[PDB]
Ligand binder design. Structure first.
Ligand SMILES: [Zn+2]
Ligand SMILES: [Zn+2]
Ligand SMILES: [Zn+2]
Ligand SMILES: [Zn+2]
Length: 187
């Protein structure tokens, strides 16, 4: 929808000044989302890997697909976000919490690029949802997400900050596999 400003555009590419990063509310991720892992498991995402492989030298289709197989792997098939609550659908069962915002963390990847993770924490003893979750979606300022990676854990926020190999990814539930694929065939 909104035209990604020059900043938003470069930011979406890991290039930005820390002074341009701003807090974001949980509502930026409101909606019902589908994990893309089952799509990969059923070959629905092969075209995307084929394209990334016919452009990446030293990388074969299988090598690329193996990279994303590890990256997308998760048992949380669906996520629901609404009115401050995040709900996780695992095995026909669900868990949720009314998450508290804990600021963000600007990361500097070894590739030189930068990224921002938005941290939330569950402070409800009753709940059985992950204690710490972090959103990352190439957005550094208020703006509704179109899809996102989410890191979840029960050890600590720092702990989630070190994870760089597994990043469960989610797209709007209503999108078909074809639509999800076309979207990935861009950015
Ligand atoms: Zn700084
Ligand atoms: Zn469910
Ligand atoms: Zn990403
Ligand atoms: Zn996108």
């Amino acid at each position: 929808g909104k035209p990604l400003t020059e900043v938003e555009q470069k930011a979406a590419n890991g290039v930005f000044d820390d002074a341009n990063v701003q807090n974001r509310t949980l509502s930026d991720w409101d909606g019902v989302w589908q994990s893309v892992y089952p799509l990969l498991q059923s070959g629905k995402l092969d075209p995307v890997f084929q394209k990334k492989a016919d452009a990446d030298k030293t990388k074969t289709f299988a090598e690329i697909k193996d990279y994303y197989h590890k990256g997308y792997a998760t048992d949380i098939e669906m996520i629901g976000i609404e009115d401050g609550i995040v709900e996780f659908h695992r095995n026909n069962e669900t868990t949720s919490c009314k998450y508290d915002y804990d600021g963000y963390k600007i990361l500097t990847y070894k590739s030189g690029k930068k990224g921002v993770r938005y941290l939330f924490e569950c402070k409800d003893p009753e709940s059985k949802a992950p204690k710490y979750i972090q959103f990352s979606d190439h957005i550094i300022a208020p703006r509704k997400s179109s899809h996102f990676h989410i890191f979840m854990g029960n050890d600590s926020q720092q702990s989630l900050l070190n994870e760089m190999e597994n990043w469960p990814t989610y797209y709007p539930y209503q999108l078909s596999s074809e639509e999800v694929v076309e979207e990935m065939m861009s950015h």
